[PDB]
Design an enzyme around this catalytic site. Sequence first.
Site, PDB file in Angstrom:
ATOM      1  N   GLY A  62       0.579  -1.012  -0.068  1.00 31.67           N
ATOM      2  CA  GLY A  62       0.023   0.043   0.062  1.00 31.67           C
ATOM      3  C   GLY A  62       0.731   1.204   0.012  1.00 31.67           C
ATOM      4  O   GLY A  62       2.083   1.285   0.363  1.00 31.67           O
ATOM      5  N   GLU A  63       0.002   2.388  -0.335  1.00 26.06           N
ATOM      6  CA  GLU A  63       0.758   3.575  -0.571  1.00 26.06           C
ATOM      7  C   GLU A  63      -0.097   4.757  -0.273  1.00 26.06           C
ATOM      8  O   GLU A  63      -1.109   4.732  -0.869  1.00 26.06           O
ATOM      9  CB  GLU A  63       1.711   3.814  -1.701  1.00 26.06           C
ATOM     10  CG  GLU A  63       2.301   5.080  -2.090  1.00 26.06           C
ATOM     11  CD  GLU A  63       3.239   5.259  -3.153  1.00 26.06           C
ATOM     12  OE1 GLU A  63       3.327   4.251  -4.276  1.00 26.06           O
ATOM     13  OE2 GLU A  63       3.860   5.986  -3.181  1.00 26.06           O
ATOM     14  N   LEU A  81      -2.526  -8.469   8.423  1.00 25.13           N
ATOM     15  CA  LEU A  81      -3.687  -9.347   7.724  1.00 25.13           C
ATOM     16  C   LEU A  81      -3.745  -9.363   6.229  1.00 25.13           C
ATOM     17  O   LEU A  81      -3.303  -8.416   5.667  1.00 25.13           O
ATOM     18  CB  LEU A  81      -5.296  -8.893   8.438  1.00 25.13           C
ATOM     19  CG  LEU A  81      -5.308  -8.612   9.726  1.00 25.13           C
ATOM     20  CD1 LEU A  81      -4.706  -7.717  10.773  1.00 25.13           C
ATOM     21  CD2 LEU A  81      -6.910  -8.686   9.991  1.00 25.13           C
ATOM     22  N   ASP A  83      -8.202  -7.252   2.717  1.00 27.76           N
ATOM     23  CA  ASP A  83      -9.252  -6.362   3.026  1.00 27.76           C
ATOM     24  C   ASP A  83     -10.697  -6.767   2.383  1.00 27.76           C
ATOM     25  O   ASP A  83     -10.675  -7.487   1.642  1.00 27.76           O
ATOM     26  CB  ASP A  83      -9.001  -4.963   2.636  1.00 27.76           C
ATOM     27  CG  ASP A  83      -9.005  -4.861   0.980  1.00 27.76           C
ATOM     28  OD1 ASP A  83      -9.883  -4.653   0.340  1.00 27.76           O
ATOM     29  OD2 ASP A  83      -7.625  -4.790   0.528  1.00 27.76           O
ATOM     30  N   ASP A  95     -13.266   7.193   8.612  1.00 31.53           N
ATOM     31  CA  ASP A  95     -12.879   6.735   7.154  1.00 31.53           C
ATOM     32  C   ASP A  95     -13.154   5.373   6.889  1.00 31.53           C
ATOM     33  O   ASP A  95     -12.543   4.491   6.630  1.00 31.53           O
ATOM     34  CB  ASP A  95     -11.493   6.954   6.889  1.00 31.53           C
ATOM     35  CG  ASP A  95     -10.981   6.908   5.409  1.00 31.53           C
ATOM     36  OD1 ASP A  95     -12.055   7.128   4.502  1.00 31.53           O
ATOM     37  OD2 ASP A  95      -9.873   6.631   5.086  1.00 31.53           O
ATOM     38  N   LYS A 102     -14.457   2.336   5.366  1.00 34.71           N
ATOM     39  CA  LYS A 102     -14.930   1.814   3.775  1.00 34.71           C
ATOM     40  C   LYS A 102     -14.391   0.345   3.809  1.00 34.71           C
ATOM     41  O   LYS A 102     -13.406  -0.113   4.669  1.00 34.71           O
ATOM     42  CB  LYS A 102     -14.218   2.755   2.954  1.00 34.71           C
ATOM     43  CG  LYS A 102     -12.793   2.891   3.275  1.00 34.71           C
ATOM     44  CD  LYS A 102     -12.474   4.092   2.002  1.00 34.71           C
ATOM     45  CE  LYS A 102     -10.791   4.463   2.231  1.00 34.71           C
ATOM     46  NZ  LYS A 102     -10.298   5.335   1.141  1.00 34.71           N
ATOM     47  N   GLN A 117     -12.142  -1.070   2.056  1.00 31.50           N
ATOM     48  CA  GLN A 117     -10.807  -1.263   1.902  1.00 31.50           C
ATOM     49  C   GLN A 117      -9.863  -0.765   3.318  1.00 31.50           C
ATOM     50  O   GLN A 117      -8.800  -1.067   3.286  1.00 31.50           O
ATOM     51  CB  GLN A 117     -10.136  -0.235   1.015  1.00 31.50           C
ATOM     52  CG  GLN A 117     -10.889   1.186   0.612  1.00 31.50           C
ATOM     53  CD  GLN A 117     -12.041   0.908  -0.428  1.00 31.50           C
ATOM     54  OE1 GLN A 117     -13.091   0.905   0.048  1.00 31.50           O
ATOM     55  NE2 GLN A 117     -11.659   0.631  -1.647  1.00 31.50           N
ATOM     56  N   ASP A 148      -6.437   1.453   9.684  1.00 33.09           N
ATOM     57  CA  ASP A 148      -6.116   2.955   9.068  1.00 33.09           C
ATOM     58  C   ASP A 148      -6.840   3.942   9.936  1.00 33.09           C
ATOM     59  O   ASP A 148      -8.108   4.506   9.293  1.00 33.09           O
ATOM     60  CB  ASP A 148      -6.642   3.080   7.700  1.00 33.09           C
ATOM     61  CG  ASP A 148      -5.766   4.226   6.897  1.00 33.09           C
ATOM     62  OD1 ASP A 148      -5.211   4.941   7.664  1.00 33.09           O
ATOM     63  OD2 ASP A 148      -5.860   4.384   5.819  1.00 33.09           O
TER      64      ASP A 148
HETATM   65  C1  LIG Z   1      -2.947   0.131   3.012  1.00 33.91           C
HETATM   66  C2  LIG Z   1      -3.727   0.094   4.601  1.00 33.91           C
HETATM   67  N1  LIG Z   1      -3.308   1.322   5.312  1.00 33.91           N
HETATM   68  C3  LIG Z   1      -3.185   1.521   6.686  1.00 33.91           C
HETATM   69  O1  LIG Z   1      -3.084   2.422   7.472  1.00 33.91           O
HETATM   70  O2  LIG Z   1      -3.180   0.069   7.255  1.00 33.91           O
HETATM   71  C4  LIG Z   1      -2.834  -0.165   8.686  1.00 33.91           C
HETATM   72  C5  LIG Z   1      -1.281   0.028   8.776  1.00 33.91           C
HETATM   73  C6  LIG Z   1      -0.814  -1.238   8.491  1.00 33.91           C
HETATM   74  C7  LIG Z   1      -1.811  -2.345   8.779  1.00 33.91           C
HETATM   75  C8  LIG Z   1      -2.012  -3.604   7.998  1.00 33.91           C
HETATM   76  C9  LIG Z   1      -2.400  -3.776   6.583  1.00 33.91           C
HETATM   77  C10 LIG Z   1      -2.489  -5.374   6.256  1.00 33.91           C
HETATM   78  N2  LIG Z   1      -2.622  -5.734   5.132  1.00 33.91           N
HETATM   79  C11 LIG Z   1      -3.057  -5.354   3.945  1.00 33.91           C
HETATM   80  O3  LIG Z   1      -3.463  -4.313   3.848  1.00 33.91           O
HETATM   81  C12 LIG Z   1      -3.175  -6.220   2.533  1.00 33.91           C
HETATM   82  C13 LIG Z   1      -2.572  -7.434   2.283  1.00 33.91           C
HETATM   83  N3  LIG Z   1      -2.592  -8.326   1.359  1.00 33.91           N
HETATM   84  C14 LIG Z   1      -3.552  -8.004   0.469  1.00 33.91           C
HETATM   85  C15 LIG Z   1      -4.490  -6.788   0.663  1.00 33.91           C
HETATM   86  N4  LIG Z   1      -4.293  -6.093   1.763  1.00 33.91           N
HETATM   87  N5  LIG Z   1      -2.263  -5.806   7.642  1.00 33.91           N
HETATM   88  N6  LIG Z   1      -1.895  -4.897   8.577  1.00 33.91           N
HETATM   89  C16 LIG Z   1      -3.026  -1.381   9.502  1.00 33.91           C
HETATM   90  C17 LIG Z   1      -5.374  -0.207   4.278  1.00 33.91           C
HETATM   91  C18 LIG Z   1      -5.662  -1.634   4.314  1.00 33.91           C
HETATM   92  C19 LIG Z   1      -6.072  -0.698   5.670  1.00 33.91           C
END
Ligand SMILES: C[C@@H](NC(=O)O[C@@H]1CC[C@H](c2cc(NC(=O)c3cnccn3)n[nH]2)C1)C1CC1
Lengths: 274, 298
Positions: B11-12, B83, B86, B127, B129, B131, B145
């Site tokens: 993610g970004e 995890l 999403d 926020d 949603k 995602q 998030d």
């Molecule tokens: C980009 C994130 N931004 C955010 O602030 O997330 C927090 C910081 C990181 C923490 C986090 C993210 C994650 N895994 C995934 O996102 C994932 C893995 N494989 C496939 C699809 N998705 N596990 N734990 C929670 C949004 C999803 C919430």
Amino acid sequence: GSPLPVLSWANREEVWKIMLNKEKTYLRDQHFLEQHPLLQPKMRAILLDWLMEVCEVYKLHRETFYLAQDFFDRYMATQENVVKTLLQLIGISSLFIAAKLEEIYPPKLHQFAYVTDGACSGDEILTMELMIMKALKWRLSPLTIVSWLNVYMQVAYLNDLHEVLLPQYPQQIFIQIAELLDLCVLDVDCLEFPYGILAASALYHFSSSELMQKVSGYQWCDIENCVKWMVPFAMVIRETGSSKLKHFRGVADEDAHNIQTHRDSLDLLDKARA
Amino acid sequence: MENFQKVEKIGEGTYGVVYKARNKLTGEVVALKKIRLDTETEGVPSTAIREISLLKELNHPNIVKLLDVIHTENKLYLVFEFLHQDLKKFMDASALTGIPLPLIKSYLFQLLQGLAFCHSHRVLHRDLKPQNLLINTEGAIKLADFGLARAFGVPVRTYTHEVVTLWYRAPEILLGCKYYSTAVDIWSLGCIFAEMVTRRALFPGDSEIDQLFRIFRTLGTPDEVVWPGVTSMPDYKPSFPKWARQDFSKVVPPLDEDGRSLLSQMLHYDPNKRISAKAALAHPFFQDVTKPVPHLRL
Ligand SMILES: C[C@@H](NC(=O)O[C@@H]1CC[C@H](c2cc(NC(=O)c3cnccn3)n[nH]2)C1)C1CC1
């Protein structure tokens, strides 16, 4: 006991107990300056008073000032052997963190350096903000002194609708009680008393024990020690009278009481301790 | 920062990039939110300071855990529980077959448990949603998030306007309310509930006025009787067209009677009447998932 009414959005006793349990995670030490033998209690009062003026100039909220006060006191409790010239940096960096937490559109970094008249560079502030936040273990969400006054004023004016989240109370008496608290916060001995006790004792001096207990939950015995200590500060405010509510350019008038103000409180603080 | 090996970028955002990483000693995987401080003119971003301080006091099984905050080399590393998916991608993967109803109910129940915990701690997520809702391989779903989240006071004051992603944004925000609190998160969760049921976004607007009209066409154009004060709101217009409220047997066909009732109360127009996260947990839609605890009356 809890003064909150029944809450549609949670168990009233649960919300209040979380708020109470919060004040166990957040420790204060009225004697933390004994960890810094080269510092006097007066220097803290002058620094806090300066931060108050800074807040009014940029129309920062009272909550922002009291976060900066709390960050300052708790960070000092973790440190040792600090000198005078480092105080302005620790204070303004506390206020920087506080403004970024609380204001919708906080002032920029260079403005926080600009008000130190060059004694603190932007790079110095950024270094200090990380040191502060790390030493505080990133515990940056206390229930400030002024946040309790906000709760106490809502409960005092609770209608039969018992809506506790929409603000409703006279702005004029709020800023008058805040004025007593702004003075007491300059005296380091205030940290002996929990922030909720401090705010309830200031409210008592402007009303009664019955109203105090109704809106704060604390009995007269809980605050008697605080009230007796607040005695000189309360009468100093009474001798000079209370201030009027101000209007601030670009600030909605329903938020006008929430802006930090500054008054010559240091000479009034000197008119006590006897 | 040595025992962690970056495994995959996941993610970004504006102030940082999220990586999947793996401890080489223990085999433990985490998510790393990296914040390069050299690029930040204002120091640590306000959204980062807020999220860290909030999550250090929000420990709950349905909230993604913040494990550590590490400062090194002009960088700030936030270490999170990991995890693997999403809810948005789970709903797309399930789009042809549908998510089974007991799993929709279990996910909603857990989301309401995590939201109820946030709200009792006086935190708004703002926020919610699909995602931002993460799921593991053990049937759990978690709020994630918190960069747009905010602690609220009792009573609140005026907070940031135009929060929440557009499709999940409550009508009181779209109409310009001066004060808001916990009801905005419940509206988002009700939108998400219906989206799990229909596999389509409930209100997929492309502008603020298109979003508000999509709500009006489904729930009826609100008036003073159903929403006292609506006609006095800053963005309300008497020129809004009058649509009739639609029967929920057509809005959410698969949903039974208890589900239709719970959804209606989560999408109440009046934020003061909209069901709370705590009350929703007591709804008979979950009467089989949970049993009530005895309540002292003192
Ligand atoms: C980009 C994130 N931004 C955010 O602030 O997330 C927090 C910081 C990181 C923490 C986090 C993210 C994650 N895994 C995934 O996102 C994932 C893995 N494989 C496939 C699809 N998705 N596990 N734990 C929670 C949004 C999803 C919430």
